[PDB]
Write a protein that binds this ligand. Structure first.
Ligand SMILES: Nc1ncnc2c1ncn2[C@@H]1O[C@H](COP(=O)(O)OP(=O)(O)OP(=O)(O)O)[C@@H](O)[C@H]1O
Ligand SMILES: Nc1ncnc2c1ncn2[C@@H]1O[C@H](COP(=O)(O)OP(=O)(O)O)[C@@H](O)[C@H]1O
Ligand SMILES: [Mg+2]
Ligand SMILES: [Mg+2]
Lengths: 187, 467, 509, 471
């Protein structure tokens, strides 16, 4: 056997077996930034009431789901190493988990330049003068030549603060600090 | 019925992936590209056009990709009148090498039970002709028997005497079905049957149809030997209407081989280590032996009781089906009495006056009584003395000695050894003779003249000649 | 469910292209090795039960054919196999050298040489996995096979073409019933007759090496390693080498069966093959059963112990006799493996350690031992005296409780305590002293006829040794009139009456 | 360093590592970085995608995933030689006695193979230890293999520390004590019982013993490899130097039993009563390296714990074949005060043979064992009939048999702190003569309390006079 390029996520399960065999095969010949553009076009033709009618049908035939997608994957735009991959999943019986692999390849390819975004969870939204700081003072932490991304979700049970999660960091400043006043009642 | 490539071989378990003609369960496959026939019987379905099957010969030299056909039926066997006097294994091939079995129609080995409205509702008694078996533990018709006693007791001479009595008054042929038997003792059984007259290598005058599945044949082919010896036994019930017999040797190796198949597939075992389907698997075999309206099948099965444990899961389940027992013990052979039958420990479930009548019950309960107190005062006479028992105890010495010698009988299949002619007695000649010893009409007869005779008129005849 | 060969390196090449660089029809790489079990990606054409041959020089055996890989047991150490090692094929089921160039040599379970003399010079081979004969090519056994032990030859006799199980607890005398079975054959194996010879094989499974080394020196000095093969899968090996080792020795002893000769094989012991199979199954993840044995373990000892046959005149007239050895654990003959092998074979010889310390050696129980053939596998003279002897040592067992505190009994019961304790003293026998057959018919004729009742029980084991040395030297012409005629005629039954009584006078001094 | 792997899964004491470049073979050693103590992991399986399954030799606390793992290129390499005498050593070959390091010039990797069939010395001898049950009934042999069975609390650390006194001081060759998982208290006595007795000398170079100690406060992967660090020091003295060695191991059941503690965490289906499915294979890989070849000799004495006094257990009953001599201590005998507890009717040797020990030694020890099996058939009569119902011959049996049973007992020298008696050491020529006379009848006129705890038979009449004077 041979050694392979290490993906910077290393997920597990039935996704990350096939979603690393694709990352290692396409990182050879430097086919990396191209192949995500082709995997997002099979990511639209999978959801079709004739294509998805037999991509998850058990009772069609073991063989005719191999010729029907191989004729489909080659003619319209592309003939890269993905045409072998769709032929590889279909030859094994893993056609049901096909949307799982591309959602697994996307999170594996995103970290090659991405951030795994933070999650500010405070209140009803804010103005521009207090948000463009937190979209810039959250860039002062990382410092590795990167372009940050973010999510926002509103929760009122946190009464008077904001929680944020840069990766797996969780600097919590909120109204948990009422429960921390148990030490007054704790002798 | 189509062609299927192989895809896995693990032990005695083959895995066959068809394309269109997916066979049903219990369908016999046939591997192509080999020397002699290797069959496979389909036992599951797994999805993805894959079955799984239990092989019935050695699983060596099988390549991943061989093409295996489909017979479109279960294991079909030569079923006919020209199969008596022959030997075949589980899949019909002759192994005595006397020529191929030339037969017209075949039959599959897997069927269902007789129907609810095909049964018989009046219990009848199959006379054999043996003196102890007719009276003190009578056989039913359609019933099931247990035979206890191993080697060294006078056992195989009892089996061949059954077959040379069922064909002299009843006309129904038999089957032998050795399940997992010894290859060394399958030949002394064959070669004794030839010189005794039941199998004859010249003509159309045979009685037994040997079906030998032997001990070095894989566990998938050891369970199916009592079905192939049952399938032969139904042509002489269905297609001819006779009173079949059927010997299985023995009923424990049928059970033990089912637990090996069930553990090669993966099923979690039951109590002490047997298979979960232990009573249904015995059910679907033992329910095909009944008395339908055309004819019947009778059965006679030997039982091995492991570790002297009569409540072990395998002889518990087998005793739920029995209608009799027969016990061969070592001690009765020492007295000189043949066959070695213990008349106090051999039972019969139909021993009841509504089934056997009033005359037959009040004799086999009388002669069952006179031999119970003699076992009690086989100690008082063994310590205190002889003349010290009462004068009414000098009659329980006589009439428990004159009777247990009249439970002996000169067989016919051992004709040259004893030199005496083999005698048969009907069922009203068993009853006419035992009543007159408890009545003491023949109280003036010595205890040696009651030895190896036929009717009551012979013992008396024998006594006159002496001295 | 993931599948074994679905690893991240197998799928990775199939996305690149077609697999032309490796062919996979003949060679397959290894996925995962552990504890003597390998997993191989490829090898599409491998037959079941086929030897493979690894990259580091070792061998293999194919047992699991699975839809994405093959699982092969490894002979030898596992620190030589790794992940990524090419495996190849030989193209056959395993075979072993076989001839008469094995006699006097010591071989392991693959037919190689270990005694350091030199390579085997045979020009024949044989597959280890062949079948038994059928119902037809056999005949009922009629040939005596003599051990030289007064108990084994007179109470539980063996014939040629029979299985006989040596069963008993530890430290009881098991290995020594089957080592003067070998030494006794030198009487016949140097003479001129051909249908009385015998060629013995000893199989040692799992013993330590320096008990075999103490056995090639026991047999050389007693001059019986010119017709004895020694097959030795010992304890330091791998587990499949101890699995093949009784098949490897039952094919070495079938060439002597197909050619009108005779043989005798001694598996020692069959309760270590069955543990060597069980280690191999439960690492191949085959489903367990009772006592974690696999389901096919009656199928191990049934296809092996049915190759011992007595063939007939149209096939050559050969034979093969097998004595398998089984060790119980505290008299428990109702465990799993000791109840398979009692059902298969044709009798057992049962040795206890209570009788070993009460002064009865060889420590044979007579009550719990049987041979199923028995009286047909005896000479016509040993049949004559043991029919009075087996019965009278059986009447002693029923009255054997009364003997402890008894003098107020009947004169008949005081007789069975008398005669039964003389016959027990005859059957004692020293280690490594096999006897000729017609000599044992002299000793047993003295006890069972009545010429020992007037003696003291510590003077029985002296009288036998003084009766034998008088009859070897001064009556050698009458210990060849039984070895030729076979049956004791009345012209010899009246002559031994004038020897024993004319020696019983001038003895007690 | 090569193949600097990384840790992925620490589940118990079974760590799995993942290698980028170079996969190491089975049975190697791996060095976990960044710890102040030395933790050594040994490779055991190859899993696929370049991950192996190891076993730690220390505590698995503080193991963070993603931690580097080096590789040495061989199995574990201990020190060995002549300078390892009078020392105590670890499983991976380190000092544990705080005397400094072991300065040797030769290392031996602990994984070797059993010597072949053509390197087997065949000769038997005799060996006299001084005990009237060993030397009479189950005699030893110079170069044989000796196993001490019996349950818990019956006398196995005493009978093995008395033979260290008897044989291993009057011996020209060397000795090794390997402690495979026992009480750390008992590993402080024998370090100090042999400093005052001259076998260990802490200033000069004339010590005659070497110690290997991994005890029962140790993780169960390191209690499976001090059985092999023992017979690697005890093989350099046999093979390389042409000397004669003695091998003392206590206890060898903790080698098997610490293999059942990581069987299912490795990934195997467990066998019968709970042991690993490789019982008689990992055992016989080790018990064939303890043999006498034609370059030297080894006399091995191993203590064998029988769990719950159950001899038919699979861990002792597969050890009865790797041994020449068995001395089985019972508990129903040591409850009667008889010490040494050795069962007379269950010990057995190979050389009990009328051609090695002589036809006078043999006729005695086959009459001691024959009168003790005659005793037990009378003990079932006494429980009903009582003692004063028996006949006059059977009363003579019970009295001699109780005289013989009390005479098999002997005060050891290491019971001078337990009982307060004084110790004996009986020669062989007196042992045969003393037992020959009790069977004859030449001491039928004494009380039984004379025979309890004496040496020679002439001391058992010097007690029956003191009992009659103080009457
Ligand atoms: N007939 C006999 N007379 C005297 N001694 C005997 C006799 N048979 C065996 N022995 C003694 O028994 C001892 C052990 O016997 P052996 O080892 O042959 O039996 P075993 O049951 O095979 O033991 P294991 O099973 O441990 O190999 C030997 O030392 C031998 O001296
Ligand atoms: N001479 C002796 N014989 C028998 N037992 C003794 C003797 N001296 C002391 N004992 C006691 O017997 C016990 C035996 O335990 P020991 O042999 O130390 O451990 P083990 O449990 O390994 O047998 C000791 O605790 C000791 O108190
Ligand atoms: Mg042995
Ligand atoms: Mg201790």
């Amino acid at each position: 056997f041979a050694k392979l390029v290490r993906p910077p996520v290393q997920i597990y399960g039935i996704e990350g077996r096939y979603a690393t065999a694709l990352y290692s095969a396409a990182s050879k010949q430097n086919k990396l930034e191209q192949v995500e553009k082709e995997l997002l076009r099979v990511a639209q033709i999978l959801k079709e009431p004739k294509v998805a009618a037999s991509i998850m049908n058990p009772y069609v035939k073991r063989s005719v789901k191999v010729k029907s997608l191989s004729d489909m994957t080659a003619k319209e735009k592309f003939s890269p190493l993905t045409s072998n991959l769709i032929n590889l999943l279909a030859e094994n019986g893993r056609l049901s988990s096909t949307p799982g692999v591309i959602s697994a390849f996307s999170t594996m390819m995103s970290v090659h330049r991405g951030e795994v975004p933070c999650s500010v969870t405070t209140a009803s939204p804010l103005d521009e003068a207090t948000l463009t700081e937190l979209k810039t003072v959250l860039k002062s932490f990382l410092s590795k030549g990167q372009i940050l991304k973010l999510e926002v979700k509103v929760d009122p049970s946190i009464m008077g603060g904001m929680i944020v999660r840069i990766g797996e960091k969780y600097v919590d400043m909120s109204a948990k600090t009422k429960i921390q006043k148990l030490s007054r009642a704790m002798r | 019925a189509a062609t299927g490539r192989i895809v896995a071989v693990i032990g005695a378990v083959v895995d066959v992936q068809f394309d269109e003609g997916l066979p049903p369960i219990l369908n016999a496959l046939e591997v192509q590209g080999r020397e002699t026939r290797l069959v496979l019987e389909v036992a599951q379905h797994l999805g993805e056009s894959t079955v799984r099957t239990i092989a019935m010969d050695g699983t060596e030299g099988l390549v991943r990709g061989q093409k295996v056909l489909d017979s479109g039926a279960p294991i079909k066997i030569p079923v006919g009148p020209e199969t008596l006097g022959r030997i075949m294994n589980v899949i019909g091939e002759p192994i005595d090498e006397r020529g191929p079995i030339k037969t017209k129609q075949f039959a599959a080995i897997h069927a269902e039970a007789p129907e609810f409205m095909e049964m018989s509702v009046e219990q009848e008694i199959l006379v054999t002709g043996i003196k102890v078996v007719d009276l003190l533990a009578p056989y039913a018709k359609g019933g099931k028997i247990g035979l206890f006693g191993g080697a060294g007791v006078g056992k195989t001479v009892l089996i061949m005497e059954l077959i040379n009595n069922v064909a002299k008054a009843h006309g129904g042929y038999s089957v032998f079905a050795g399940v997992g038997e010894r290859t060394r003792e399958g030949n002394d059984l064959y070669h004794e049957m030839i010189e005794s007259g039941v199998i004859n290598l010249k003509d159309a005058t045979s009685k037994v149809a040997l079906v030998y599945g032997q001990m070095n044949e894989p566990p998938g082919a050891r369970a199916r030997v009592a079905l192939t010896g049952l399938t032969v036994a139904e042509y002489f019930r269905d297609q001819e209407g006779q009173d079949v017999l059927l010997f299985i040797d023995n009923i424990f190796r049928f059970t033990q081989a089912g637990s090996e198949v069930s553990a090669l597939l993966g099923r979690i075992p039951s109590a002490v280590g047997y298979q979960p389907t232990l009573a249904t698997d015995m059910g679907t075999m033992q329910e095909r032996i009944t008395t339908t309206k055309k004819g019947s099948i009778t059965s006679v099965q030997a039982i091995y009781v492991p570790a002297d444990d009569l409540t072990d899961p395998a002889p518990a389940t087998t005793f739920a089906h029995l209608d009799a027992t027969t016990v061969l013990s070592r001690a009765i052979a020492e007295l000189g009495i043949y066959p070695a039958v213990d008349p106090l420990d051999s039972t019969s479930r139909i021993m009841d006056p509504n089934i056997v009548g009033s005359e037959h019950y009040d004799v086999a309960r009388g002669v069952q009584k006179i031999l119970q107190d003699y076992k009690s005062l086989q100690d008082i006479i063994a310590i205190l003395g002889m003349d010290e028992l009462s004068e009414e105890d000098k009659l329980t010495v006589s009439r428990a000695r004159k009777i247990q010698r009249f439970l002996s009988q000169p067989f016919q299949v051992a004709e040259v050894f004893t030199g005496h002619l083999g005698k048969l007695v009907p069922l009203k000649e068993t009853i006419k003779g035992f009543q007159q010893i408890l009545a003491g009409e023949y109280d003036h007869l010595p205890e040696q003249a009651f030895y190896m005779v036929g009717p009551i008129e012979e013992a008396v005849a024998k006594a006159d000649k002496l001295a | 469910k993931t599948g074994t060969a679905e690893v991240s390196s197998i799928l990775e090449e199939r996305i690149l292209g077609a697999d032309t660089s490796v062919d996979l029809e003949e060679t397959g790489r290894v996925l995962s090795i552990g504890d003597g079990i390998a997993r191989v990606h490829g090898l599409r054409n491998v037959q079941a039960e086929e030897m493979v041959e690894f990259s580091s020089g070792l061998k293999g055996m194919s047992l699991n054919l699975e839809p994405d890989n093959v699982g092969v047991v490894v002979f030898g150490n596992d620190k030589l196999i790794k992940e990524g090692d090419i495996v190849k094929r030989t193209g056959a089921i395993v075979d072993v050298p076989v001839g008469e160039e094995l006699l006097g040599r010591v071989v392991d379970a693959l037919g190689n040489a270990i005694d350091g003399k030199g390579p085997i010079g045979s020009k024949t081979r044989r597959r280890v996995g062949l079948k038994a004969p059928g119902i037809i090519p056999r005949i009922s056994v009629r040939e005596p096979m003599q051990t030289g032990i007064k108990a084994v030859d007179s109470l539980v006799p063996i014939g040629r073409g029979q299985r006989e199980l040596i069963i008993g607890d530890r430290q009881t005398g098991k290995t020594s019933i089957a080592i003067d079975t070998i030494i006794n054959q030198k009487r016949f194996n140097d003479g001129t007759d051909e249908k009385k010879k015998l060629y013995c094989i000893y199989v040692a499974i799992g013993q330590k090496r320096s008990t075999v080394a103490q056995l090639v020196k026991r047999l050389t000095d007693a001059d019986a390693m010119k017709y004895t093969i020694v097959v030795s899968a010992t304890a330091s090996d791998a587990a499949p080498l101890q699995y093949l080792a009784p098949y490897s020795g039952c094919s070495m002893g079938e060439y002597f069966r197909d050619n009108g000769k005779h043989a005798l094989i001694i598996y020692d012991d069959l309760s270590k093959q069955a543990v060597a199979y069980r280690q191999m199954s439960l690492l191949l993840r085959r489903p367990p059963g009772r006592e974690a044995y696999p389901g096919d373990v009656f199928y191990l000892h049934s296809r092996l112990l049915e190759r011992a046959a007595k063939m007939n005149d149209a096939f050559g007239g050969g034979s093969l006799t097998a004595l398998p050895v089984i060790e119980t654990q505290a008299g428990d003959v109702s465990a799993y493996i000791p109840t398979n092998v009692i059902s298969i074979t044709d009798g057992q010889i049962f040795l206890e350690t209570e009788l070993f310390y009460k002064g009865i050696r060889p420590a044979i129980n007579v009550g719990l031992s049987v041979s199923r053939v028995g009286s047909a596998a005896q000479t016509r003279a040993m049949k004559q005296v043991a029919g009075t002897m087996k019965l009278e040592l059986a009447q002693y067992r029923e009255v054997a409780a009364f003997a402890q505190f008894g003098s107020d009994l009947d004169a008949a019961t005081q007789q069975l305590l008398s005669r039964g304790v003389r016959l027990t003293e005859l059957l004692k026998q020293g280690q490594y002293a096999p006897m000729a057959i017609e000599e044992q018919v002299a000793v047993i004729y003295a006890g069972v006829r009545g010429y020992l009742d007037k003696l003291e029980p510590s003077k029985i084991t002296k009288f036998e040794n003084a009766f034998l040395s008088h009859v070897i030297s001064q009556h050698q012409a009458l210990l060849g009139k039984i070895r030729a005629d076979g049956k004791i005629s009345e012209e010899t039954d009246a002559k031994l009456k004038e020897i024993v009584t004319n020696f019983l006078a001038g003895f007690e001094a």
